[model samples]
Target: STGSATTTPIDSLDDAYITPVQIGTPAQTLNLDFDTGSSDLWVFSSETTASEVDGQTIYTPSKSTTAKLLSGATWSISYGDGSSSSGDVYTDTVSVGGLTVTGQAVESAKKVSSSFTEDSTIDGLLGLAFSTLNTVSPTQQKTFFDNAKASLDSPVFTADLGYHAPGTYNFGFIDTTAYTGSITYTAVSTKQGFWEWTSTGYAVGSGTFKSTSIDGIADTGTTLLYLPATVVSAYWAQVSGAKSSSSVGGYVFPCSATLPSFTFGVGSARIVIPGDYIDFGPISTGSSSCFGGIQSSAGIGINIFGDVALKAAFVVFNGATTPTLGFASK
Candidate 1:
């Protein structure tokens, strides 16, 4: 079977996307972040303290007849941005884009980090990473995708992220009209439970392309492009007033400076990002410094090709056999 869900961007820049999903027998719907980097489907729930839940929507498993608590099972997760959630597990009916998985493990959060608690728009996280990364203790659980893949026409999904527009997440099928040009595919590895791949090289702006290999993951959970410190510095070198900022937590440059287009390699293919995408926004009101979308992933072992890079292309997450990443300009 095939299905698709329209994703709503949380802000003007399309930094992150959220899709609606139904969890429970009578179908309690929640807007969840489709995170390819994480492997657990966790949501704010009735189990959470009222104060902690705040304005966020909470899933009440007790209200769903199909919900079954998994005795002794618990889960916890924290993202690179320091947002976290933890709680017990329940087996319930989880549906997305009309595709339903019975007895899917739904992590009911009892607590969340400050940032997560403050994010009222995001009720849960629907992890698309390899099931090996699931955090459920005592008995690890498979993701809803894995549970439903057996019945799918093809174990494939596509991410179509558009700037200032709602894009789509297609499951079990690829919408040929969503992109142009043949999909330039690169081999993907999930040894660390991530869709990690190596890009042959990259270049700052429209300059000559460099051939140094870079390894990273295509993570929808993250908001920016995170490469090595050295790589980030190379791009910043092109800007006159760029400097490392402890307060902004990355490289910030003068808003007036001309930003160059960033290009990343996909085997023999090239994907170029416009300068407008590189200049995230001013650091703060009236501040001369503007935050860059591309920054260093130092201390974090894996680099992240987050929305900044991925949104520039139409992405195919092939799961039919060995996971492969296919990219094409939107």
Candidate 2:
């Protein structure tokens, strides 16, 4: 069988696309962010402190007839952006799209950072990364796709993240009709519990594609595209008005400036992000000075192909073999 879901991007956050998932016996639907970077399925629950609840919908285990607690099992997670959440655990029936998995581990959040509480529309997170990255104590927790993989015709999923619009995520099968041209397949190194891969090289505009390979991970949880500091400096140097701004927290340029396109290589596959996408938003005013969507990857030694890059194409995460990623233009 195949499972499919549709996600619509939240314009205000300029961060993630939210999808609906059903939890519990009576079916409490939660709008969750399907993140591939982290492996922990957590939700704001009744146990959460009222002060931290904000406007998020709380999951009440008592309302579900089939809710089963995994006694003493707990979970905690922290993000690079300083967002965090910790909570207890429950094993219940969970459904994504039309596919259902029984006895799925669902972490119920009792505490969350102010960053999470601010995004009141998001009730929880559905992790798509490897189960080894799961934060549950005592043992590991498999993802919805992992638990349902045995029942699926194919152990694969596709992400089509639209820019400021709606996109589709498919499980158990690839929808070739959704993309144009041939899908370029690249080997994935899952050593870090992420769909990590190395790009052949990258370039600014029509500039030469340097052979300087870079290790990176495709992360849906992150908002911007992160690369080496040297690469960031090279790109911004080409823009006359671009400057490092501690106030804006990254490189910023005049909003009216014409930006060059950024391209990354996957073997022979070249994916180019439009120039307009390079400018995320302005510091202030109508469009006086804009913050760049491409910035330094910090000192993590890994670049992040976040929503800014992923939205430029259709991606397939195949688990059938050595875990390959297929990229195609949408």
Best by lDDT: 1
Cα lDDT of candidate 2 equals 0.87
Report the lDDT of model 1 for residue 91.
Answer: 96
Where model 1 places Cα greater than 4 Å from the true spot, the runs are none
lDDT string for model 2 (1-330, tens) is 888889888665367788889999799998899998998989999999899988988889999998999999999999878899999999988888788899999999999999989998888898988888999998888888888888888999889988878888888998989988889989898898998988888889889987778888888888899999998998888888899888778999987789998888878988888877777776775868888988998766679999888888899988775798888887
Please give each candidate's TM-score.
0.97, 0.96
Model 2 regions lying over 4 Å from their true place: 285-287
* Per-model CA lDDT versus the true structure: 0.89, 0.87
Q: Give per-residue CA lDDT, model 1, range 148-239, as digits (tens).
A: 88888889888888666788898899889999888999999889999899998889977899898999999988888999888899999988
Q: Each prediction's Cα RMSD? A: 1.3, 1.4
For each predicted model, how many residue pairs clash, with residues at least 3 apart or on different chains? Answer: 1, 0
User: CA lDDT of 253 in candidate 2?
Assistant: 91
